[PDB]
Amino acid sequence: VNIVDYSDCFEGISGGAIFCNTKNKEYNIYNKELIETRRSPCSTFKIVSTLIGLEKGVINSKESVMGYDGTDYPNKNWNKNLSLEEAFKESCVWYYKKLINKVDAKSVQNILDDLKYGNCDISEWEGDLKNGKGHLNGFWLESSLQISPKEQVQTMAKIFEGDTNFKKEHINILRDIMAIDVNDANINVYGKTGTGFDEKNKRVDAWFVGMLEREGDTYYFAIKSDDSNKEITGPKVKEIAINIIKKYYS
Numbered sequence: 001v002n003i004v005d006y007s008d009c010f011e012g013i014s015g016g017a018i019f020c021n022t023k024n025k026e027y028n029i030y031n032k033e034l035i036e037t038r039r040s041p042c043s044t045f046k047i048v049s050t051l052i053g054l055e056k057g058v059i060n061s062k063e064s065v066m067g068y069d070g071t072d073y074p075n076k077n078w079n080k081n082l083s084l085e086e087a088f089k090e091s092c093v094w095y096y097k098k099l100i101n102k103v104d105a106k107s108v109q110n111i112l113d114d115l116k117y118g119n120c121d122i123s124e125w126e127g128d129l130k131n132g133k134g135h136l137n138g139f140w141l142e143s144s145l146q147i148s149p150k151e152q153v154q155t156m157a158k159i160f161e162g163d164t165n166f167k168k169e170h171i172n173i174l175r176d177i178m179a180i181d182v183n184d185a186n187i188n189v190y191g192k193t194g195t196g197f198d199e200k201n202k203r204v205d206a207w208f209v210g211m212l213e214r215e216g217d218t219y220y221f222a223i224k225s226d227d228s229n230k231e232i233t234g235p236k237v238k239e240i241a242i243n244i245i246k247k248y249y250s
């Protein structure tokens with residue numbers, strides 16, 4: 001466990017980062033207190049909910065559809081019978097809500113327990129209804145489920161090193177749709193952003209979680225902001241993560 005200083009890449013935004021290489025058990029931590037604090041995963045939960053849907057047969061491949069019903073949404077890409085790959089990349093809430101609501105709560109509880117997914121608290125299945133957004137909510141969106149950045153990395157490592165019971169074919173579908181382009185062919189980066197606002201504490205929950213493969217070694221990472229500036233989003237923290245990767249992990 002090496003404490004590191006990545007502040008220069010955070011451009012004055014408050015947050016922290018953790019990178020773990022499981023071959024040599026090298027844990028690099030910036031802002032240890034934040035890295036151990038549990039927070040709502042927001043859209044980073046799509047990493048796990050995709051695997052749940054695959055395991056239960058609700059979806060089967062990166063082409064799988066969830067039967068769009070014609071409901072009007074402001075994001076033009078949500079207004080179609082989109083595939084799993086497009087729903088993941090466009091963060092289509094209705095698709096992932098419909099997916100999870102086809103799965104019984106016991107099954108979800110047991111999968112989260114097996115993954116040690118933070119507090120594994122799905123008690124508020126419907127999510128944070130007081131925000132007025134009705135069915136666009138759920139337990140993983142600023143609600144009962146909370147996970148620390150360190151626990152995110154531990155979960156990613158267990159999934160993608162083959163240490164869970166999820167099928168290898170399903171893990172590879174996730175890998176496929178998580179891959180991003182960082183304009184550097186010499187590193188493979190995979191990840192997912194998440195964005196929420198913590199109304200109790202008036203701070204953002206802005207995430208980028210994933211992995212990086214660079215010539216033999218693999219690092220699992222979580223970058224997290226808790227800034228009070230509402231302009232700080234998941235996509236903003238992904239930019240910060242990319243800067244760290246290129247500066248320190250290239």
Ligand SMILES: *C(=O)N1C[C@H](NOS(=O)(=O)O)CC[C@H]1C(N)=O
Pocket residue numbers: 042043044090091093141192193194195196233234235
């Ligand atoms: C997940 O965090 N969400 C879904 C959607 N996309 O998030 S992302 O841009 O961070 O990937 C919008 C934000 C958030 C939500 N409001 O549900």
